[PDB]
Structures are given as structure tokens and as C-alpha cells.
Amino acid sequence: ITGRPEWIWLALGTALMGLGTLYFLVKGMGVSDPDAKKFYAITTLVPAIAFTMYLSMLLGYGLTMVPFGGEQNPIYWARYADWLFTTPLLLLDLALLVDADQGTILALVGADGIMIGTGLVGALTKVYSYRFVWWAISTAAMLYILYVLFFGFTSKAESMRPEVASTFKVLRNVTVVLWSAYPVVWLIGSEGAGIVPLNIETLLFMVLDVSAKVGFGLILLRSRAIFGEAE
Amino acid sequence: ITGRPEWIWLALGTALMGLGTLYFLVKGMGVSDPDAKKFYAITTLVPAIAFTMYLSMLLGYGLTMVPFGGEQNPIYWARYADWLFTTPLLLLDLALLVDADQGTILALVGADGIMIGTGLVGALTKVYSYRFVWWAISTAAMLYILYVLFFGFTSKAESMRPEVASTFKVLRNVTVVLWSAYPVVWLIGSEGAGIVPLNIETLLFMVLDVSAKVGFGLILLRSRAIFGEAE
Amino acid sequence: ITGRPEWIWLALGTALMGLGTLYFLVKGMGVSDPDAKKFYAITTLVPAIAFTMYLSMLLGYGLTMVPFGGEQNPIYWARYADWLFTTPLLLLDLALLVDADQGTILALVGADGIMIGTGLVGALTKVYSYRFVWWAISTAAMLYILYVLFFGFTSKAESMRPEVASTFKVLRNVTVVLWSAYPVVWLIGSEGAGIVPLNIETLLFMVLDVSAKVGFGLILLRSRAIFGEAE
Ligand SMILES: CC(C)CCC[C@@H](C)CCC[C@@H](C)CCC[C@@H](C)CCOC[C@@H](CO)OCC[C@H](C)CCC[C@H](C)CCC[C@H](C)CCCC(C)C
Ligand SMILES: CC(C)CCC[C@@H](C)CCC[C@@H](C)CCC[C@@H](C)CCOC[C@@H](CO)OCC[C@H](C)CCC[C@H](C)CCC[C@H](C)CCCC(C)C
Ligand SMILES: CC(C)CCC[C@@H](C)CCC[C@@H](C)CCC[C@@H](C)CCOC[C@@H](CO)OCC[C@H](C)CCC[C@H](C)CCC[C@H](C)CCCC(C)C
Ligand SMILES: *C/C=C(C)/C=C/C=C(C)/C=C/C1=C(C)CCCC1(C)C
Ligand SMILES: *C/C=C(C)/C=C/C=C(C)/C=C/C1=C(C)CCCC1(C)C
Ligand SMILES: *C/C=C(C)/C=C/C=C(C)/C=C/C1=C(C)CCCC1(C)C
Ligand SMILES: CCCCCCCCCCCCCCC
Ligand SMILES: CCCCCCCCCCCCCCC
Ligand SMILES: CCCCCCCCCCCCCCC
Ligand SMILES: CCCCCCCCCCCCCC
Ligand SMILES: CCCCCCCCCCCCCC
Ligand SMILES: CCCCCCCCCCCCCC
Ligand SMILES: CCCCCCCCCCCCC
Ligand SMILES: CCCCCCCCCCCCC
Ligand SMILES: CCCCCCCCCCCCC
Ligand SMILES: CCCCCCCCCCC
Ligand SMILES: CCCCCCCCCCC
Ligand SMILES: CCCCCCCCCCC
Ligand SMILES: CCCCCCCCCCC
Ligand SMILES: CCCCCCCCCC
Ligand SMILES: CCCCCCCCCC
Ligand SMILES: CCCCCCCCCC
Ligand SMILES: CCCCCCCCC
Ligand SMILES: CCCCCCCCC
Ligand SMILES: CCCCCCCCC
Ligand SMILES: CCCCCCCC
Ligand SMILES: CCCCCCCC
Ligand SMILES: CCCCCCCC
Ligand SMILES: CCCCCCCC
Ligand SMILES: CCCCCCCC
Ligand SMILES: CCCCCCCC
Ligand SMILES: CCCCCCCC
Ligand SMILES: CCCCCCCC
Ligand SMILES: CCCCCCCC
Secondary structure, eight states, X not given: OTTSTXXXXXHHXXXXXHHHHHHHHHHTTTOOOHHHHHHHHHHHHHHHHHHHHHHHHHHTTTEEEEEETTEEEEEETHHHXXXXXXXXHHHHHHHHHTTOOHHHHHHHHHHHHHHHHHHHHHHHOSSHHHHHHHHHXXXXXXXXXXXXXXXXXXXXXXXXXXXXXXXXXXXXXXXHHHHHHHHHHHXXXXXXXXXXXXXXXXXXXXXXHHIIXXXXXXXXXXXXXXXXXXX | OTTSTTHHHHHHHHHHHHHHHHHHHHHTTTOOOXXXXXXXXXXXXXXXXXXXXXXXXXXXXXXXXXXXXXXXXXXXXXXXXXXXXXXXXXXXXXXXXXXOOHHHHHHHHHHHHHHXXXXXXXXXXXXXXXXXXXHHHHHHHXXXXXXXXXXXXXXXXXXXXXXXXXXXXXXXXXXXXXXXXXXXXXXXXXXXXXXXXHHHHHHHHHHHHHIIXXXXXXXXXXXXXXXXXXX | OTTSTTHHHHHHHHHHHHHHHHHHHHHTTTOOOHHHHHHHHHHHHHHHHHXXXXXXXXXXTTEEEEEETTEEEEEETHHHHHHHHHHHHHHHHHHHHTTOOHXXXXXXXXXXXXXXXXXXXXXXXSSHHHHHHHHHHHHHHHHHHHHHHHHTSHHHHTTSOHHHHHHHHHHHHHHHHHHHHHHHHHHHSTTXXXXXXXXXXXXXXXXXXXXXXXXXHHHHHTSGGGSOOOO
């Protein structure tokens, strides 16, 4: 395990996701409100899935070698397995907060699936120049998602409770900033142009992942917006 | 890319799915009705997914070699990845049109999953005679789906709005004819008996795919059946 | 096929799932009640999926070799493909019976996904001692599911119809006993410590699978709890 310099960040990531999972699990024990239960379920599952995939990367299972540029390049494929399930759960948290219509939710989840799926294909593609074609398609799917979060959701939040409108606005802003960093790190890291070494890349993704999951969850689950308006 | 004679049909397929995706995306921009949004979301996602998988076939990612009959046989596995997601979306379009009950929808999607999954296993099976066992099981799942579309849905459409009944009937008929061709092409093509060469097989699937997705979508999204009855 | 001593149990399993599938399919033909249709759909799909995966194991497709302990160890990976889809369907049968809230259903299905997914990783892991780390995480996800079935569902059933409360209690008890055997068989069988040989392991899983699917389904589909209260 320690044979890879990036192991320290995989281990820290595993620990922080594990701790985040346990914290949300305990916190949600005292919850009976049916609406709050939905948000706790979604939000606890996110770091639990990430915990398993960080562990698989730490132990070496979630790593494969991909030939491109005349080299055997270490590619952590387990990231995409994580993201396939956790990024639509994160979007679902946002969509339920603002009572999004079903068509909009399906558009978001579908675009998200395309985003992660094409990122996976790009990560595993052996023809170097083609990796960036997949990156571009994935990034276009991301831009669609960000567009919807701003010009379909923000003006939906404003007709809702003030506490859900303010909580949505904060989580929207956190999401757009954090999620936009992922394609940049991929592009300059070992999957793309290879300018930033894998150990630093792994650190960067770990900070983004913990912030986008445990950070996000801490903000959401401390808000009164997750509860039905009750006396 | 041009090293494979079937590349021209993969390229045309990619282009037509891409163009179809953009057309539906633009067309649905001016839509606020919650019901119509569902149909636009579902129907736009279908060629978008197909676009990505056609591209993966064009670039060579979605192709593998399978030993059977003492030969290395080129198998485009990306078709099944496409179909796994797009065929239940197509069925969902039909089921929502007639306000199908939840049990019926689950039966359809489940049978569809079995249909595509067993087709994939058959496509990748190395014992030649066993490929046709999987083809038979998949075809039985197809026949179940077609049965339900006729003797569970058609008489559901007739108690609904005339515009939804007439639109459903047309899309049902398009679906049954087009979908029934797929097992025949598989059986006589490079996956099955090998009587029709891969380049012609690829052409045939491209015509079926564009018709079943973009053709289907053009009929559906031009109907007033996708809108709630409103003043 | 007969080259593997466990083939007889794979063949019997295939037959019993096939027969169970046909029986439930015929039985549900005379059903119009929308609630009952849901239970028939879910419950018929379960042995149908299991039939396909038992067949893939019989024909040899669903088997791979995994190096650990200095040996090539036969691992039937198709079990996890089965279980990935059938165990959440089984939980859905239980959850719908007691009209579980959406948050609880998502927690169950999510924990179940983690349970099966980590079992799959453990089954395919090449470092022997690490296989048991994945077994432990999977078992913890199982224990969560069993906890919810007892201390979240049982007291939900009691405020419902007596026929649904009594049917739920029986199916809950069947589920907890049968499902708890699976991690034990894995641990002592060819995936784990290797004390029980593969042919006996295969027998054990076949008895558990038929009981947990066809047995379970026979109890559920003969109950009046699956019908809406109607005059
Ligand atoms: C509604 C939304 C969910 C829409 C989803 C959007 C989605 C369509 C976007 C594209 C997804 C698609 C790229 C998934 C591809 C998975 C694939 C990378 C798995 C690895 O297999 C690739 C090659 C080795 O590189 O296998 C070597 C050759 C092997 C023989 C491969 C044969 C097995 C195939 C992988 C079977 C395909 C199954 C499905 C792709 C399962 C989807 C997995 C998940 C990653 C989407
Ligand atoms: C409700 C509905 C959805 C019901 C669904 C119906 C469904 C049950 C029908 C059968 C689906 C099942 C056949 C999927 C099999 C996928 C498999 C072909 C992927 C390729 O792996 C096959 C061999 C190489 O040929 O791998 C070589 C050996 C490797 C070590 C394989 C180990 C990895 C396994 C593939 C893990 C299994 C994961 C699940 C099958 C994911 C499902 C993928 C999708 C195609 C259904
Ligand atoms: C809401 C709930 C559903 C939550 C779900 C919980 C879930 C997160 C729990 C963990 C699931 C995760 C372990 C699935 C891993 C599948 C993996 C074993 C498939 C086989 O690939 C493993 C190695 C060979 O051993 O591939 C060799 C290297 C290859 C290059 C691998 C590259 C292809 C990757 C497999 C692509 C990943 C796609 C997704 C994992 C699809 C999920 C399949 C299913 C088994 C969950
Ligand atoms: C918890 C993990 C999260 C929130 C991950 C988010 C990841 C993305 C938004 C990834 C986006 C990518 C692209 C837009 C193109 C390049 C490849 C990706 C997959 C890194
Ligand atoms: C957009 C793509 C569509 C509508 C594809 C439909 C495909 C089928 C109905 C495929 C059916 C098959 C069988 C019935 C058995 C042989 C294998 C298949 C998968 C080709
Ligand atoms: C129809 C099949 C059923 C009901 C299978 C149930 C399987 C399980 C509950 C498996 C549990 C496992 C663990 C808890 C850890 C070890 C690995 C598994 C996957 C066997
Ligand atoms: C969105 C953030 C992307 C920028 C990442 C900056 C990383 C700077 C680290 C120094 C680069 C290491 C190069 C020498 C090894
Ligand atoms: C459902 C349509 C299946 C029939 C396809 C007919 C294809 C005819 C093309 C000629 C066959 C090529 C054989 C000589 C290369
Ligand atoms: C939950 C049941 C697990 C116990 C399984 C008992 C199997 C006993 C069979 C005898 C073991 C075979 C060892 C000699 C080959
Ligand atoms: C490819 C995996 C996509 C599914 C991820 C799980 C999250 C799905 C959330 C469903 C949202 C509800 C839509 C109506
Ligand atoms: C194996 C992939 C199956 C899922 C495909 C996505 C479409 C699912 C549509 C869900 C229909 C709603 C059922 C209640
Ligand atoms: C990884 C596969 C998980 C999906 C299995 C299919 C069963 C899903 C049942 C959905 C229950 C409804 C939740 C709201
Ligand atoms: C186009 C929608 C406006 C809100 C999205 C902001 C786009 C940020 C760009 C992210 C950088 C990705 C490379
Ligand atoms: C049995 C249901 C009647 C409607 C379905 C028509 C079946 C068409 C056969 C398709 C050919 C597949 C090989
Ligand atoms: C902790 C919840 C109480 C009900 C679950 C009973 C646990 C049975 C243990 C199963 C054995 C697995 C190794
Ligand atoms: C070796 C790099 C070749 C450049 C490929 C860039 C493709 C980016 C596509 C953006 C439309
Ligand atoms: C080499 C071909 C052997 C014939 C197999 C046909 C099987 C079809 C099954 C239909 C019930
Ligand atoms: C070779 C076996 C080494 C023992 C591993 C047991 C790990 C079990 C983890 C339970 C917390
Ligand atoms: C990680 C295993 C958890 C089993 C005990 C249940 C914890 C309490 C959860 C309350 C919903
Ligand atoms: C509760 C702490 C969980 C941390 C387990 C994984 C950390 C890796 C240590 C090497
Ligand atoms: C908008 C046109 C999209 C076409 C891109 C793929 C066509 C392949 C050209 C070689
Ligand atoms: C209807 C009987 C189904 C049995 C088919 C599979 C049994 C395997 C026989 C070798
Ligand atoms: C993006 C950083 C999130 C910070 C989380 C802090 C949570 C405290 C309530
Ligand atoms: C099956 C062929 C479909 C033809 C689509 C034409 C759409 C015009 C409205
Ligand atoms: C766990 C054993 C189940 C027994 C099923 C018998 C069904 C008869 C109604
Ligand atoms: C990591 C366990 C958290 C302890 C409880 C925190 C207050 C709910
Ligand atoms: C008003 C919300 C500001 C949140 C910005 C957080 C940036 C990481
Ligand atoms: C809305 C601001 C987006 C900031 C992008 C930051 C990418 C590192
Ligand atoms: C391909 C872009 C379509 C242009 C608009 C067509 C009329 C909505
Ligand atoms: C009355 C509907 C006829 C549609 C037939 C289309 C055949 C491709
Ligand atoms: C309902 C008519 C079906 C026609 C099947 C055509 C197969 C090529
Ligand atoms: C296996 C076929 C079952 C025959 C009908 C049983 C009574 C519904
Ligand atoms: C009162 C229900 C008892 C069911 C026990 C079944 C054990 C297999
Ligand atoms: C509730 C009793 C569980 C029995 C476990 C049996 C495991 C073989």
C-alpha cells in the first residue's frame, strides 16, 4: 500500500468519509419527520459509497494501468464508480429541496450519467488525442447541469419557503464552484496532459470530494429546510 | 478509423443522433408544462445516449474481439450499453402516454432489462451453439413486452384522451415493427449465423436505431398528447 | 458442463427458478387490482433474473478464476449480478407491504447495494487477508438492513391491516433467517476460508436462493395482503 506516494491522501480520504458517514448516521437517529428522513438517507449514503471506493483505491483494487503516450499510466477507475452513484444523489438533494418537477430531475440525472460515463470512457481510452474528445463531451454535460441549477432551480427556490431558498442558494453556490474544479484537475492531471503529478492530483480530488460530500452534507443537515413546516 | 468498412455507417449514425439530440434540446426550450417536460426529458436523453455510444464505436472503444467458430469475431458491445438505457426510456415514453400503473411499468422495464442483458451475454458467449440459447431467452422477453404493449396498453389508451389514444397507437405500431427487426438482424448477422456481413449489419442497425429513436421522437414531440389538457 | 461436480446443483437451481417464474407468471394473469399487480411484477421478476444467472453459471459464462492463496480459485461472479437486482426487489416487496416512507426505502436499497457491491469486490480481491475486510463491511451493511426490518418496519406493520401485519411478520422472519446464512456460507466456502468445498457450497446457496425467492414468493402471493381493501 505504502509503495504508492499518493497512499497518504487515499488513507486520509477513507478516514474522513468513514467519519462523515458515522456522524450523519448518528445524527439522523433522532429523526421521524418523513421529509427529513429523505434528506438524511440521501446524504448519509453519499459518503458511505465514497468510503468504500476510497478504500478500494487504498488497497489497490480500484486502480488499473492504461497504455497511452507510450507509457503504462496508473488510472484510478474507482472514482467513476463512486461518482456514478454519488453525483446523482447530490443532485437529488438539491432537486428535492426546491420540489423540482419530475422531468427536470430526469434531465439532471441523465445528463449527470452522461457526464460520468463519458469521463470514464475518456479515462480508459488508449488513443491519447481521443481522451480529450470525451473530456469535452463530459464537460458539455456538466455545463448543462450547471445551467439548470441556475436558470431552472434558483427561480424555483424563490417561490418556496425562505429557509429552503436560502439553504438552496448556499448549496447551489458550493456545488457550482466545487464541481467545476473536477474537469480542470482531470485535464492537467495524470488522466489528461500530465502536468500535475498523480500524488498532487490525488490530494486535490480528496479535498474536493470531502468538501463536496461531507462539507455539503454538514450545511444541508443543519438546516431547518429539510423539515416539513410543522407546528 | 477508416480501416473498418463499416465506419461510414457508424459516422452517419453518430451525426444523425447528434443532430437529433440538438433538435430536441432546442425544441424543448420553450416548454413550461410539467407533463410535456417529462416527455422532452425522456425523449432528448435517448439520442444523446445513443450519440455517445455510436461515437465510442466509431473511435473503436466500443468494439471487442470474441473467439467463436475458430475465429476472432468483431463484436460491438457498446450497442448493449446504449440499449440498456435507451430501450427502457422508450418504453417509459409509451407507458406515461397511457398513464400505465406502476406494476405494469416495472414489468416492462424488468423484462426489457432481461432482454438486453441476455442479448449481451449471447453476444459475448464463446460456445457457438449457446449463443442461440441466449438469443431465444432474449426473444421471449421481447415477446412479453410486445404482448403487454398490445393487450395491456392499447385498451388502456382507448379510455384516455383521443389525442393520446391516436398518438399511442401510431407509436405502438412503429415500436412493434422496428423492434421486431433487431433479433432478426442479430441472428443473421455477425453475432449469429454470419450470413450478412458486418458492414451491412451495421447499416441495418443504424437505420433501425435512427428510426426507433429520432423517428419515434419526431412523432411524439409534435403531438399535443404530451401536454396536459389546459385552457 | 458436467466437468464440474457442482453442475448438478446449478442445473437444479436453474430448473426450480424457471418453474417458479412460470408459476408466478401464470398465477398473475388473472389480476387487475393495481396494488396486487405491483407485488406480482416485483415477485415474478426475482426468479426470472435468478433463472438467467443460474443458467449462465451452468453454461460456464458466469465463472471466473481468481488468484489467491497461490491457487486459481473458481469464483462464480454471476451470483452478485443476480443479487444486485433481486435483493433490492425482495426488500421492495417488504417495504411496499408496510407502506414504508421513501427515505426508508432509499436507505434500504442503498445499504443493500453497498452490501452486494462490497461482497463482489471481496470475491474478486487477490490479496487474501483483504477479502475478509470487504466481507466485514458487507456484513455491517447487512446488519443495518436487518435492524431496519425489525426496528423501523415491524412497528409500522402493526398500525396497518391485520392481514398485512401478519404476512409482513412471517416474511420478515423468513428473510432475516435466510439472509443471515449467506455471509456464513461465503466465509467458510471457496470465497473465504475454503473449509467447505465448492460443490457443497453451491448446494447450500441453491437451497437458500430457492427458499428466499420462490419460497418467499409463494407465501406473499397467496396472501390477501397484496390486494387493496375492496368490497
Ligand atoms: C439514464 C442515465 C443512466 C444514462 C447513462 C449515460 C451513459 C449511457 C453514458 C455512457 C455509459 C457507458 C460509457 C458505460 C461504459 C462502461 C464501460 C466503460 C465498462 C468498462 O468496459 C470498457 C472496456 C474496457 O475499457 O471493456 C472491454 C470490453 C468488454 C467485453 C465490455 C463488455 C461489457 C460492457 C461494459 C457491458 C455494458 C454494460 C453497461 C455499460 C453498464 C453501465 C456501467 C456504468 C459505467 C454506466
Ligand atoms: C430490473 C432489471 C434491471 C433486471 C436486470 C436483468 C438482468 C439480470 C439480466 C442479466 C444482466 C447480466 C447478464 C449482466 C452481465 C454483465 C456482464 C456481461 C458484464 C461483462 O462481464 C462478462 C465477463 C466477460 O464476458 O466478465 C469477465 C468476468 C469478470 C470478472 C466479471 C465480474 C464483474 C461482473 C460483471 C459484475 C456484475 C455487475 C452487474 C452485472 C452489473 C449489470 C451490468 C448491466 C449489463 C446489467
Ligand atoms: C445506490 C446504490 C446503488 C449504491 C451502490 C453501492 C456501490 C457503490 C457499492 C460498490 C459498487 C462497486 C464496488 C462496483 C464495482 C464493480 C466492479 C467489481 C466491476 C468489475 O471490475 C473490477 C476489476 C476487476 O476485478 O475491473 C478491472 C478494471 C476495469 C478497467 C474496470 C473499469 C470499469 C469499471 C467497473 C466501471 C465502474 C462502473 C460501475 C462500478 C458500475 C456498477 C456495477 C455494479 C456492480 C454496482
Ligand atoms: C463527490 C464527487 C463529486 C461531486 C464529483 C464530481 C465530478 C465531476 C463534476 C466530474 C466532471 C468531469 C468532467 C466534467 C469532464 C472530465 C472528467 C470528469 C469526470 C472529471
Ligand atoms: C434504440 C435501440 C433500440 C430500440 C433497440 C432495440 C433492440 C432490441 C429490441 C433487441 C432485441 C434482441 C433480441 C430480442 C434477441 C437478440 C438480441 C437482441 C438484443 C438484438
Ligand atoms: C436471492 C438471493 C438472496 C436473497 C441473497 C442474499 C445475499 C446476501 C444477504 C449476501 C450477503 C453477503 C454478506 C453479508 C457478506 C459476504 C458476502 C455476501 C455478499 C454473501
Ligand atoms: C482548480 C485547481 C487546479 C490548480 C492546481 C494547482 C496545483 C499546484 C501544485 C503545483 C504543481 C506541481 C508541479 C510540480 C510537480
Ligand atoms: C429485417 C431485415 C433482415 C433482412 C436483411 C436483408 C439484407 C439483404 C442484403 C444482402 C445480403 C448480403 C449477402 C451478400 C454479402
Ligand atoms: C449456515 C450453514 C453453514 C453450515 C454448513 C454445514 C455444511 C456441512 C457439510 C459438511 C462439510 C464438508 C466438509 C468435508 C468435505
Ligand atoms: C447510472 C446510475 C443512475 C442511478 C443513480 C441513483 C440515483 C437515482 C436517483 C433517482 C432520482 C429519481 C428520478 C425520478
Ligand atoms: C438496468 C438499467 C435499468 C434502468 C434504466 C433507466 C430507466 C428506468 C425508468 C424507470 C421507470 C420508473 C419505474 C417506476
Ligand atoms: C444497483 C441497482 C439498484 C437498483 C435495483 C433495482 C431495484 C430498485 C427499486 C427502487 C425502489 C424505489 C425507490 C424509491
Ligand atoms: C453556462 C451555465 C452558467 C453557469 C455555469 C458556469 C460555468 C463554469 C465553467 C466551469 C469550468 C469547466 C471547465
Ligand atoms: C405475441 C404478442 C403479439 C404481438 C407481438 C408480435 C410478435 C412479432 C414477432 C417478432 C419476431 C421476432 C423474431
Ligand atoms: C442487529 C439487528 C438485530 C437483528 C439482526 C440479527 C443479526 C443476525 C446476525 C446474522 C449473522 C451474520 C454473520
Ligand atoms: C493530443 C491533443 C490533441 C488535441 C485534442 C483536443 C480536442 C478537444 C476537443 C474540444 C472540442
Ligand atoms: C450451432 C447451432 C445449434 C442450434 C442451437 C439452436 C438453439 C435455439 C434454441 C431455441 C429453443
Ligand atoms: C488471513 C486472514 C487475516 C485476518 C483478517 C480478518 C479481518 C476481519 C476484519 C473484521 C473487523
Ligand atoms: C454500521 C452498522 C449499523 C448497525 C446499527 C444501527 C445504527 C443505528 C441506525 C439507526 C437508523
Ligand atoms: C473510523 C476510522 C476509519 C478509518 C479507516 C480507514 C483509515 C485507513 C487507515 C490506514
Ligand atoms: C453536429 C454534427 C455532429 C457530427 C459529429 C460526428 C460525425 C463524425 C464525423 C467524422
Ligand atoms: C421448464 C424447465 C426448465 C429447465 C431448463 C434448465 C434445466 C437444465 C437442464 C440441463
Ligand atoms: C465548502 C466548504 C464547506 C464547509 C463545511 C462547514 C460546515 C459547518 C456547518
Ligand atoms: C418510422 C419512421 C418515422 C418517420 C419520422 C417522420 C417524422 C415526421 C413527423
Ligand atoms: C422458507 C420456506 C418457505 C416455504 C414455502 C412454502 C410455501 C407454501 C405456501
Ligand atoms: C462520530 C460519532 C458522532 C457522535 C455524536 C455526535 C452528536 C450527534
Ligand atoms: C452566499 C453563499 C456563498 C457560498 C460560497 C461558498 C464558496 C465555496
Ligand atoms: C461560479 C464560479 C465558478 C468558479 C470555478 C472555479 C474552478 C476552480
Ligand atoms: C439543430 C438546431 C435546430 C434549430 C431550431 C429548429 C426549430 C426549433
Ligand atoms: C396507423 C399507424 C401506422 C403506423 C405504421 C408505421 C410502420 C413503420
Ligand atoms: C406487427 C408486424 C411486425 C413486423 C415484423 C417485421 C420484422 C422485420
Ligand atoms: C407451471 C404452470 C402452472 C400451471 C397453473 C397453476 C395454477 C395457476
Ligand atoms: C411466525 C413466523 C415464523 C416463520 C419462521 C420461518 C423460519 C424459516
Ligand atoms: C433471527 C435468527 C437468525 C438465525 C441465523 C441463522 C444463520 C444460519
